[PDB]
Amino acid sequence: CSYTCXPQTYTFPTCEEAKKMKKRC
């Protein structure tokens, strides 16, 4: 459960919720 926002690696505390908490970059 990681995401990449440009050069920023984005991590979310709860991998479970990281699917519901989508990122918008």
Would you say 2 and 10 are in contact if contact means Cβ atoms under 8 Å apart? yes
Exposed e or buried b per residue across 4-23, where buried means at least 16 C-beta atoms within 10 angstroms of its C-beta: eeeeeeeebeeeeebeeeee
- Cα separation, 20 vs 25, in Å, equals 15
The position carrying tokens 């995401």 is 3
Task: Assess contact for 5 and 25: CB atoms under 8 A.
Answer: yes
Experimental method used, please?
NMR
